[model samples]
Target chain A: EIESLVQDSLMEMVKGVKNTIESDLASKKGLAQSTTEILQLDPTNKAFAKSVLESPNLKGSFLAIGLGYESDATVVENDDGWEPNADYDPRKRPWYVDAKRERKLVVTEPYVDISTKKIIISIGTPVYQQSNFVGAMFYDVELTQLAQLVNSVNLFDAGYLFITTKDGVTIAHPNAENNGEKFSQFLPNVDLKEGTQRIELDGKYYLVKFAQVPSESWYIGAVVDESIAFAMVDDLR
Target chain B: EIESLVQDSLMEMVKGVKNTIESDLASKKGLAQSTTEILQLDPTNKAFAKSVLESPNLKGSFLAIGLGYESDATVVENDDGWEPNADYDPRKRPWYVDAKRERKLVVTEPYVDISTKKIIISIGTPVYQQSNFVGAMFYDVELTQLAQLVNSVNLFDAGYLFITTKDGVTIAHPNAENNGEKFSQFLPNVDLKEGTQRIELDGKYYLVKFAQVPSESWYIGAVVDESIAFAMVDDLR
Candidate 1:
């Protein structure tokens, strides 16, 4: 049940992000301006980076526009020396290329941020103008922050929640050290199916429920100690 | 089942609308420009009106700003003689006032568009800057367009879809004449729950399902003729 709730919340957040991009693209506003606008909406600064990349125009120069909120809160051009590698090109980024190719919102697989050395996921939405694919917008969410969000939802101390990619790679877990590991290593016999299932972890049985997050290839799982999960029914007897 | 799909689509649409306003407001862009951008997004021009209200600065006068797309494809100012009454004030409008009071997205009850004489519902989102509620943004969706959207969802010709406000007021129905009426008139004992139920409408039993549209106090109900709804089940027997 908690996993379902977490999935719903994440789904709503992604929808908000996609909607902002679509609206800006529809308005024909500059990508940089829209990127900045989305950053400003979340005063808490949950997103580490917000960016947009325009298709190469007549000059064959791709307008790789972007902004970062980690070091400073301001819009910066690609060549602003923000990235440690000066050779960084927006078009070469996986999120940009995948979003333009898919022509829709996509959540990327977890990857280590080169500069921050933190596990992160990129959410990208393609932008179009006059039926032409013009560019794409992306926002980076730190995996640690995502873990914090999931951890914040307390389930009466009976269970905990974690997130994983569709392929079962752990994106977040209660134990920070366990993050980024494969779920199969934790529960070799368990399949990432929807609804409740019993699994053994750390020599203890757990009741785990899985839910798929909409619009993204990710899943949220809630694990309750089997004893606690069945305690209410046992008490009735 | 179909009602859930319709509700999901409507929720996505509303989120897009709200995100657009939030992005535009955060960027501190002009209202007219944002209004124009939203119009460019939808090729069908379903929204009849897209507008924004400005806050009172040093001057005590309320800047009742707005734009309308009706009869002709053009943006018109508030006093552009679009309304026959010539006294249309943005501050006095229900959508504008309610959005300000709620400080979030609001959907107004069905009403007659004084200028167009068509039934309309206004979706408005409040604009805030620096923790101050500056004003609000609005988009007008005609009842005909909404009905067209609901009717477009094909239930294998076995059922139809309709929309209603939280208070049981019918906003969109398959039959245009039945719109703007209360749902109680059609199904006296129906209490707009969030799932499927059996209902009697027009002396015929219906397999009705209701789903809520997010970000607004509205619901979408899918009604299927009982005979057709149970035909497959009867065949199995």
Candidate 2:
């Protein structure tokens, strides 16, 4: 009886998750369609992109996506007058310029801005008009809001939520203690790449779902804490 | 220390319940096989029927099984046939004829005859000869026996148990006062026919499981009170 009840409840919970993901995906698609139209109207659609950047609602959720063609990376000393931070090297950080030269969207994994000590994810996309390609528009979203969304899921006791990119970068997490740590950094040479990979992190099992957004190949993930999946068992007992 | 110990014990308890239910279902399958064999033999073979009827362990169980093939009932002649009375006729019950025509096992609902003062569940199985209609072997089992089975479960102070039919009829309940009451009779009726039916009954929330025994399509329900359902929630909160 306990098993049946727990299974039934879990099934409903899964359905709810599916509905949420479906809506989220639909919203992303809508944004893609509208962004494409805006780019067609004005190749340098900074007003449209800036509107999202300035709006409080879109400021957190918005992302710019495009093809990743001719993208390159380099390493150099910190310069370019942005900030004199340890990570502000022009050559080492040349991936941003190459990403722009590619004339497409690029969503970079979360990284710590050494100067500000803040976590940021960059979103860049090229605006195109007819046969011409305009400069890329890139913006950063604070990882704080992503953390809020992950923590909002009511996992059972002993359950926690975390997000990691396909390259195993811990983007946002409920346990703030691990604020700026990346999974790949900690598990160096550990094959931490992601895409629905399941592994024990602290003795607990998890069901992980990761999707690579075609717009930028940026991976978005939702990890369901296993303890919560079987919470009804405790309830029945 | 106190809270951690309690959590550990509760986890064990949940696992225990899951193991118990799995074993119970397995045993029930075996019992069902034996029952089918005994019921299919020649009706005159009183030995096989007596063996099943006289099982000491079965007698101790609260579940009552009956083959109600040749059931008969009649409404009282003088005291309005709509209501039951001592003069009720044995041949006038609609279910009796319905069972024979269906040639299948029929489990009756717990209803007040309005005429007869007796409370019982009628179980009937049709006997056949080369697909030709023979007669139904029918019997009535008193529900009071269910309490004996339920009380046998050693629940914590907070747990509860109930047996219900597919339609949410409270067949055998620990709370005898509500015995034979329809599930909806004791609780508010919402859109329970669809997904995730959650309800509060008698001041307690219950997560209910509606399972149909594959063998006879008999509805077997088991429920865990709502407070217990949130055992893990209390800790998380």
Candidate 3:
């Protein structure tokens, strides 16, 4: 019964992605063209895109394909317009750009958005847009969205999802509302700058997947929200 | 010192939003116009609107807004091109539209995509055009961003976050790779039916805040990584 149910559900899921492509993504000229252009412009990011497309967990819902490089390039009218370096002095190297030159996927530490007051995470993957390694793609996902998906599995009444980059910038989340907010000070107990680590927050439990994707150095996470951190493991039993 | 630090940190967390408004939100046209439009359209939704506007949680980030009546209405075109039915079609509800009609601030909740295959979250807020309450303001924030944020937080190198709707729809999340795929079966141990409850997945701790924002019947939530939850409390101590 479980096998059959899984099979049936898989089919349904496929149908849904197809519909989304037909309706929202591919159906719209700009979206379709942009996706293709993005893939072409940033081929390295394409691998992760394909990975997400193929991953059953990331098959649908809000998913992103990001790219990071030695420097924030002054590209054409891109989706996120490039801004001048914080200090045009050009005297110093930006963190992200320098990391990009290293050609590694870096998942910055999770932090709060000073602007929006929400929490966020950024997963940066290396991009080989040109034959040479150009930069890394950072997939951005909101904390709220992550919580919703995990909750759907029917594990518990209360649950949430959390992620962080190697550097510790809260990129996306419900608690931290702004775009790029840092929670380093607020979350004094949490230590994101380190490699994969786990602790407790508030009164709940969580499972942390803190692995920097090989080569790209981007951090990848899969959090299990539950009452007791160990309760989530029961599902595997 | 620890208690004071924790208090100061939380307070600072709240202040972060104010800083963002002065620096980023005030300058962004999309956010400014959207927020003002919602306020001008209704007066009853003031309480809810104020909660969001002043909400340390909902203040920043690119949020979607929607306005709906308790009942359904006919679709009408206002000039943006496609006419939206004044009546609530549920079927015709877009992410931003759903966000507006919701009652309170929803962190995350799963929603079946139009195709019923993929699951997505409809981050929403309640809408009130004037003295009378109206519907909700809704938006869709991708899940990957949430994970990225979780990854960014440093304290728990190994914690995660997830958000869910009241009804168990996997709106956005880190494990969303299985998005559209039915998680109801994969991890039977987790119980998502309860409001603001928590369960475990893969041996971790998590916390969830659930609600049916604009509608008493709908749901939304915020899932916190276990370590982060504990860390926050620890900071308080």
Candidate 4:
């Protein structure tokens, strides 16, 4: 449910950014001037901040626009003392490159953010002007926010929520330290798919229900302790 | 956006069906008897019909439960006086067989429903009991309903919506007659992916934005007449 909400919100934000460019900015200005105007409007970053404020589970979001090698065009939140390395080309970033290649909105696999030292996923959308490929817009979301959201879900007293990439990398969990852990490390033979499964986690059995985030390669899961899930049967027994 | 809503609604309905069986019926009755009891509850079919009624562009829904060779237990709405052939077996039906083989929810390619004589798509979910395969539940949606929905969307005076299966089957369109037509028949060698594309349809160019219905093998599209999309350029000229 949260993933669906995030996906919808992300799409809306991207549409808004696209509209901002097409209707009000792009037609009137060149790429460089339009980039500056877009930064001033700050719809992308503002939308991200609004999302974080709206959901306790979202920490922060960033909007990065690649303006080729000649110009540095990027706007990110929570970058008080952060500096990019010399080779920090926005076009080379995985999100930007993938979005450009796909020519659509994409969510990248989770990775550790260099400055924050926290796991994060980047959602990106490529921007076009009259059949010309100009640049891309990206939003970065912290996995910790997702972790907090999962922790707040009241599935059962011992139940919790966790998120994983399609390949089983644990992106979000109740335990912050487990954010970067791989689900395969714990269940080497288990193949994760949509729907429910009975799996042993940390030597304890759990009833896990997982669903894919629409249009993305991430899965959101709700898990309950097997003992608690079948406690009624135990009582009857 | 409508596609996302439909996807989420479909997932929730599947989850609800799973929960109803696991909580109340599956434990008490065997798969055979529980299948009958589940039909009486009608949560799955009822939910599907309700969705059609709620959406301005939905015709009806059906749920077919395979009961081996003994009997055919199926619930369908908007299916007046419709009878299956003597050899008709729910297990052998395309929707049922595909869902069972996949062991997941699936949307079939659009096809003609004999009784209604309308193009339709079937969304099917396979149900399992304690690792044992039981049957499948399917929801049938008329393509005409999608046509109505698309026709109602006010993209521009001449704007429209179109939908197609991953394999290029036109499942929905502003024109009812166009539904079920293969997109490839109109534009050969054109592979539709999730993103915007400039395509020529019916001797006219259109700006089309298409996105995948997450978790499903269908695509929803919004198309605008290129003349209107770039009317500003004409004004500037």
How well does each candidate superpose onto the true structure, as a TM-score? 0.45, 0.35, 0.27, 0.36
Global CA lDDT of candidate 3, please? 0.38
> Over the stretch B24-129, how does candidate 1's per-residue lDDT look in tens digits?
4333333222333322333233332222121111011112234322223233334333542445556666666777788655567887655556666666556443
**Cα shift from native, residue B51, model 4 (Å):** 36
Once fitted onto the true fold, the runs of candidate 1 whose alpha carbons sit more than 4 angstroms away are: A1-85, A128-135, A144-156, A175-179, A185-189, B1-92, B97-136, B140-237
| Model 1 interface CAPRI class | incorrect
Task: Name the top lDDT candidate.
Answer: 1
Better of 1 and 4 by lDDT: 1
> What is the per-residue lDDT of model 2 for residues A1-237, given as tens digits with 9 covering 90 to 100?
433444443333333333333333334333333333443443443443344233332333343222212222112111122334344333233235644566554555666544345676655455465666544443445566666644433434434445566656677666554555765543332343334444466676664544444444434445555566566356534
Better of 1 and 3 by TM-score: 1
DockQ per candidate:
0.06, 0.01, 0.02, 0.01
- Quote the lDDT for A165 in model 4: 78
Winning model by DockQ: 1
lDDT string for model 4 (B126-213, tens) is 6554455555655565566555544433443436667677777797776777778886664453568866567787788776666665
Query: Candidate 2: deviation at residue A22, Å?
Result: 6.6
Candidate 1 overall lDDT versus native = 0.52
CA deviation > 4 Å runs, candidate 2: A1-36, A44-104, A113-117, A176-180, A184-234, B1-237
Scored by CA lDDT, what does every candidate get? Answer: 0.52, 0.44, 0.38, 0.50
